[PDB]
UniProtKB/Swiss-Prot annotation, chain E:
Residues included from the entire protein: 24 to 233 of 262
Domain of life: Eukaryota
Name the record gives this protein: Small ribosomal subunit protein eS1
Keyword Glycoprotein included in the entry's annotation: no
Record function comment: Component of the ribosome, a large ribonucleoprotein complex responsible for the synthesis of proteins in the cell. The small ribosomal subunit (SSU) binds messenger RNAs (mRNAs) and translates the encoded message by selecting cognate aminoacyl-transfer RNA (tRNA) molecules. The large subunit (LSU) contains the ribosomal catalytic site termed the peptidyl transferase center (PTC), which catalyzes the formation of peptide bonds, thereby polymerizing the amino acids delivered by tRNAs into a polypeptide chain.
Cell compartments where the protein resides: Cytoplasm
Sequence similarity: Belongs to the eukaryotic ribosomal protein eS1 family.
Single Gene Ontology MF annotation: structural constituent of ribosome
Biological processes, Gene Ontology terms: translation
Gene coding for it: RPS3A
Swiss-Prot record, chain F:
Protein name: Large ribosomal subunit protein eL43
Quaternary state and interactors: Component of the large ribosomal subunit. Mature ribosomes consist of a small (40S) and a large (60S) subunit. The 40S subunit contains about 32 different proteins and 1 molecule of RNA (18S). The 60S subunit contains about 42 different proteins and 3 molecules of RNA (28S, 5.8S and 5S).
GO molecular function annotation: structural constituent of ribosome; zinc ion binding
Lineage: Eukaryota, Sar, Alveolata, Apicomplexa, Aconoidasida
UniProt keyword terms in alphabetical order: Cytoplasm, Metal-binding, Ribonucleoprotein, Ribosomal protein, Zinc, Zinc-finger
One GO cellular component term: cytosolic ribosome
Pfam families from the UniProt entry: Ribosomal_L37ae (PF01780)
Summary of the function given for this chain in its UniProt record: Component of the ribosome, a large ribonucleoprotein complex responsible for the synthesis of proteins in the cell. The small ribosomal subunit (SSU) binds messenger RNAs (mRNAs) and translates the encoded message by selecting cognate aminoacyl-transfer RNA (tRNA) molecules. The large subunit (LSU) contains the ribosomal catalytic site termed the peptidyl transferase center (PTC), which catalyzes the formation of peptide bonds, thereby polymerizing the amino acids delivered by tRNAs into a polypeptide chain.
Location within or outside the cell: Cytoplasm
GO biological process: translation
RNA sequence: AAUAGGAGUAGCUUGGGGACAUUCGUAUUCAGAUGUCAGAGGUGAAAUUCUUAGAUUUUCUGGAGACGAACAACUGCGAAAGCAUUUGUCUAAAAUACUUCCAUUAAUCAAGAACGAAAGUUAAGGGAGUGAAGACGAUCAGAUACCGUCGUAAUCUUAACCAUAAACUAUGCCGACUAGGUGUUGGAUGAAGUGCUUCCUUCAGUACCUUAUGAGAAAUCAAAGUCUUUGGGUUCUGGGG
């Protein structure tokens, strides 16, 4: 009955209603501790602000961050 | 790839710098110190290349060898006549100078 | 007609393939169609092997095996009874 | 006839040979025209 | 016929048995002094039949005839080959062969060529019958294998390099390096050929021999 | 307007001689008078002045070359082989 | 004490060659074919012919004085066939029976890495 | 797909919420300035939007600002004479031709040259129908490097 | 006027007297006016240099072989020819080369040759269309024609 | 901002896609050695053939062209023809992922064009093996054939042509909708074996099995279905022998 099926979330991008599986993330760097806006699925290198040390390594999936760091979802 | 990167930078310079190409302009630019960077095609007659290199070295600016040939450096600078040597005398907002 | 769904050969997603040549008559045959038998064969019989072991040094001697792999064309394969005729319904049977 | 030549259900002589025989005949006619004209 | 004469075949110091047979050689008459006919021929010795150890039975060594005194031939190292049955046995479909090779030179200035084979391993969570690696991966594995072998070969004197071949060190090293990128299985050196041996010194050859 | 359907450069020979012979000449002559690019300057001015001798008009400089071209393929392969070492 | 020679056995679907030699290859001991021992102008492939040939070479080799043999088998070749011919088994059996000591046995059949084009047409031998 | 085979459903698609999301507090003026700077320093518009999204943290400039990025670039006057997509296609054509000029035997590269050349003509025809290209512009095999300079 | 290959005017500076002396070398293809030409045992393998055959790497293409040493070049001089070096003996001293006819020959190592193919390649590709061209060809050679 | 389209960006994405350079292996063959001694090749049976001036066979050096097995599949890539050794360089490609850009740019297409197996042609090299022609020996009442031995042209590279092939999924191409299960090659998402590995979910390739109160003249077909309940768009083609 495809009007309002709740557990359809698992289907491919292009469902009953479009919805991105991509979001923005509030991230901070271990030992430097400044807030940064960042994109889950970022496509080019991502630096920490005070001294440019890499944060996230881009690669063609969801992107792999670094071993460190802590991440809130930045959805309102 | 490295050459292509130079060519892209050069394309920016061509669009928004101040530049001049040809022997006499090159000599005046270096002599003045107006020049910031000299870009020389491989083909160039040896004696002229040598003089430009010496002048540039003397007036303390870089000389950079262009990967291809005289026509190609001209088409890279958007012109339909071969070029041999050009002097950037003011960079555009480009990453060229480093 | 159109007896064989895949024409007795494994061609899909491929325009062309190499011929290999039939070992028992030399004819050309496409590798996707050819009847391949990885015949593992011993250099001699058992009673021969027994006599060789008896004769041999070492006493832990072991006879060497033969590694061949023979490719047959359709005519040869059916003639020397590698592949039986079978029956119309059972033509998709294998293993 | 039409494009699908061959098909030997009828038992007619080999299509390729018929083609070879006819190609030879055509050559000979073409040669004769060359002498005449 | 009647004019032949036996000569004993000795092998260098590292091998255990060091008497791998007797060879007959034709007539002693001038101007062809028999020694010349004896010199330069080549011997395929099974490696097991040289140590007395059947775990090396799928390897054979080439030993070349290079120096003679009277009744004795002492020989030099000439190459290393795998027995064709063993090579076939390793090959079974659903696994994928990887073959490297390269040219390399010794500290002694022998130029050699090495042919190195390597097979994939299934490992336990895989299930699925086929185990083939990505082509990009096999290319990386092949380069890595070539790199290890040329580095290992280049280092030492020839006698030690040959000695290294005997308990098969090279394969173990190749497997350990490649494990991170892909699991491997029975990794051997299929063939070794000497390409350009340096000019002979009887002194050095015998001193190595004793 | 378009003078010949085929012949071009070899039209000077006229109705004389074999067509096949003329065709072979046509290929070599098209190659022969072709202006090569001069790798001593970047102009397309290199011409043949005599059997093996190729002058650039702009550079006033003589390149030694083939019979019918600035570069024969044999020489090009040899040159590359040397370069590689 | 013991001494080894190398017994090259070539079986083709005609002849079964027994050619035993010195350990270096170079320098023969006895070449004796299979065709030698039978006047039939067939049956150079035969087990029987091969058996006769084997016993005589074994007898001669014992007279000569090398006691024992390594066997190097060879089937025809990549340009014709990879199958060891019929009499090869017979020759091996006869040699073991004879009383010589039977050392390492190896296949050195000449295989082609490639596939250089073999004789008979694309449509192969039609016999 | 336009040429070859295969549908290829790779795509990327905006959420249902089409307003500015509350978390981003940057105002239009700052973002306008930033976009202009990136272009001026030499970057191509598709890259500028992507670069802006990741580095500066703005998804969907059309929600955070009143106007699409090509339009604002044009409004501030800085936008390229040849449209971006056409320009890159011409670049691809020039490179391909350079290879073919050196090497005359590559059948696939020549097949691709015909295919790409046709694609340029189709896109060019659309740009002529708009007023984003000069009417007497044409593209030629000869001119191609020089053309896009 | 004799041969298809052009001749190359080469200047050296004398080794026991002041000033410049001119020789005539036969030109390799791809060489040019204002090129520096080097001759000798230590000369680098590069086109149009003159080197002893003993110092070639194998499979190089050469011309101007001296059939025996010091003879100033006597094999491989006609247009578009070359020889190939095919081998160096283990004790050195001799070298093995291939003349363009199809024979293999063995020469002394210290014999000269010139790196690169002889100039004016492909000369007999072009057909001689008319009799007068043949007349002009023989006119600068030798009276030997028309044949009869 | 079209599960339309194009363009972009990203990943130690992918692959026997293309091109050029490059490199190695093996047999076969030639030449040079080497030891042997009578037959060896050849077959349904045999002969023609080759062999005491040492064949066949043994092993080694050097040369040469050819091919690149095994691994290798109801596998991969290519518009299709087609494409399988090594590394490099130059190239293209598709999928995926993408809160990146453009905003209908499209679909199929008479005209015209690009590529287009194999043979054949023209020209230079090149020439191992194979081998239309041809020559013999056989087989047969006969054999211009099947079989055998030898053997030009062609086969290979370069440079032109030729424009056809049962050039075959004998299934035009684009678009929506239908029904399961078994797999498999390529990505991406989650969870569970020792960062990595696996499995789950899901795309795009791609086959198979079962099922068609679907279809078909049946064979059979997940398209040949959604059709006298006949019309989603379009190019081409056929009309008894």
């Amino acid at each position: 009955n495809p009007d309002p099926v709740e557990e359809s979330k698992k289907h491919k991008l292009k469902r009953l209603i479009p919805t991105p599986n991509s979001y923005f993330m509030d991230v901070k760097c271990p030992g430097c501790l400044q807030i940064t806006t960042l994109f889950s699925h970022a496509q080019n290198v991502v630096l920490c602000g005070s001294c440019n040390i890499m944060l996230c390594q881009p690669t063609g999936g969801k992107c792999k961050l670094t071993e460190g760091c802590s991440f809130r979802k930045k959805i309102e | 790839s490295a050459g292509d990167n130079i060519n892209a930078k050069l394309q920016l310079v061509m669009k928004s710098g101040k530049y001049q190409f040809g022997r006499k302009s090159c000599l005046k630019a270096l002599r003045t110190g107006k020049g910031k960077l000299v870009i020389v095609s491989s083909n160039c007659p040896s004696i002229q290349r040598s003089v430009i290199e010496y002048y540039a070295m003397l007036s303390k600016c870089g000389v950079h060898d262009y990967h291809g040939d005289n026509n190609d450096l001209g088409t890279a600078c958007g012109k339909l006549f071969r070029i041999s040597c050009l002097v950037i005398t003011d960079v555009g907002d480009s990453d060229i100078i480093k | 007609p159109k007896k064989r769904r895949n024409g007795g050969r494994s061609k899909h997603n491929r325009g062309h393939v190499n011929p290999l040549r039939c070992s028992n008559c030399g004819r050309c045959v496409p590798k996707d169609k050819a009847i391949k038998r990885f015949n593992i064969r011993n250099i001699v019989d058992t009673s021969a092997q027994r006599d060789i072991k008896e004769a041999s040094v070492y006493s832990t001697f072991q006879l060497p095996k033969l590694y061949i792999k023979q490719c047959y064309c359709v005519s040869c394969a059916i003639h020397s009874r590698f592949v039986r005729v079978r029956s119309r319904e059972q033509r998709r049977v294998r293993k | 006839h039409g494009a699908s030549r061959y098909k030997k259900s009828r038992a007619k002589m080999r299509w390729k040979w018929k083609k070879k025989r006819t190609r030879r005949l055509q050559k000979k006619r073409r040669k004769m025209r060359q002498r005449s004209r | 016929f009647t004019k032949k004469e036996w000569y004993d075949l000795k092998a260098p110091k590292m091998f255990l048995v060091r008497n791998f047979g007797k060879t007959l050689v034709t007539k002693t008459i001038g101007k062809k002094l028999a020694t010349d006919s004896l010199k330069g021929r080549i011997y395929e010795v099974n490696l097991a039949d040289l140590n007395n150890d059947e775990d090396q039975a799928h390897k054979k060594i080439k030993l070349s005839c290079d120096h003679i005194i009277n009744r004795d031939c002492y020989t030099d190292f000439c190459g290393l080959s795998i027995t064709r049955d063993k090579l076939c046995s390793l090959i079974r479909k659903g696994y994928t062969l990887i073959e490297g090779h390269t040219d390399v030179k010794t500290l002694d200035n022998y130029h050699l060529r090495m042919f190195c084979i390597a097979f994939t391993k299934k490992r336990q969570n895989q299930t699925k019958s086929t185990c083939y690696a990505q082509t990009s991966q096999i290319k990386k594995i092949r380069k890595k294998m070539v790199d290890i072998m040329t580095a290992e070969a280049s280092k030492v004197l020839l006698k030690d390099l040959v000695k290294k071949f005997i308990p098969e060190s090279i394969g173990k090293e190749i497997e350990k390096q490649c494990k991170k990128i892909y699991p491997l299985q029975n990794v051997l050196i299929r063939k070794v050929k000497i390409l350009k041996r340096p000019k002979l010194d009887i002194s050095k050859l015998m001193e190595l021999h004793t | 307007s378009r003078r010949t359907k085929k012949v071009g450069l070899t039209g000077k020979y006229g109705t004389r001689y074999g067509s096949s012979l003329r065709k072979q000449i046509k290929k070599i002559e098209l190659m022969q008078h072709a202006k090569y690019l001069c790798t001593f300057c970047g102009k397309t001015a290199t011409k043949r002045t005599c059997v093996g001798i190729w002058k650039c008009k702009k550079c006033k400089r003589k390149v030694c070359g083939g019979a019918w071209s600035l570069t024969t393929p044999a020489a090009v392969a040899a040159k590359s082989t040397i370069i590689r070492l | 004490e013991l001494v080894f020679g190398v017994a090259h056995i070539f079986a083709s679907f005609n002849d079964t060659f027994i050619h035993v030699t010195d350990l270096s290859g170079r320098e023969t001991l006895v070449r004796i074919t299979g065709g030698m021992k039978v006047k039939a102008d067939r049956d150079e492939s035969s087990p029987y012919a091969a058996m006769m040939a084997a016993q005589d070479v074994a007898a001669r080799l014992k007279e000569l004085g090398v006691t024992a043999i390594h066997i190097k088998l060879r089937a025809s070749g990549g340009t014709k066939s990879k199958t060891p011919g019929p009499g090869a088994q017979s020759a091996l059996r006869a040699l073991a029976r004879s009383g010589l000591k039977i050392g390492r046995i190896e296949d050195v059949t000449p295989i082609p890495t490639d596939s250089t084009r073999k004789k008979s047409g694309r449509r192969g031998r039609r016999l | 797909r336009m040429y070859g085979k295969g549908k290829g459903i790779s795509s990327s698609t905006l959420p249902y919420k089409r307003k500015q999301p509350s978390w981003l507090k940057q105002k239009p003026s700052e973002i306008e300035d930033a976009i202009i700077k990136l272009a001026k320093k030499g970057q191509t518009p598709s890259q500028i939007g992507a670069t802006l999204r990741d580095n500066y943290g703005i998804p969907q400039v059309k929600s955070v600002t009143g106007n699409k990025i090509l339009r604002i670039l044009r409004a501030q006057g800085i936008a390229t004479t040849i449209p971006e997509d056409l320009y890159f296609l011409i670049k691809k054509a020039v490179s391909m031709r350079k290879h073919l000029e050196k090497n005359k035997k590559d059948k696939d590269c020549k097949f691709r040259l015909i295919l790409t050349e046709s694609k340029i003509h189709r896109i060019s025809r659309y740009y002529k129908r708009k007023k984003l290209l000069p009417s007497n512009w044409k593209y030629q095999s000869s001119t191609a490097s020089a053309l896009i300079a | 006027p004799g041969r298809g290959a052009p001749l190359a005017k080469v200047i050296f500076k004398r080794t026991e007297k002041y000033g410049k002396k001119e020789e005539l070398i036969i030109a390799s293809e791809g060489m040019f006016t204002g090129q520096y030409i080097s001759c000798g045992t230590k000369a680098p393998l590069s086109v149009g240099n003159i080197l002893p055959i003993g110092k070639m790497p194998e499979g190089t293409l050469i011309c101007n072989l001296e059939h025996r040493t010091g003879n100033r070049g006597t094999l491989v001089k006609a247009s578009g020819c070359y020889a190939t070096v095919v081998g160096q003996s283990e004790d050195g001293k001799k070298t093995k080369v291939r003349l363009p006819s199809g024979a293999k020959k063995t020469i002394d190592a210290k014999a000269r040759a010139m790196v690169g193919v002889v100039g004016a390649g492909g000369r007999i590709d072009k057909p001689i269309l008319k009799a007068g061209v043949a007349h002009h060809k023989y006119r600068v050679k030798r009276n030997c024609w028309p044949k009869v």
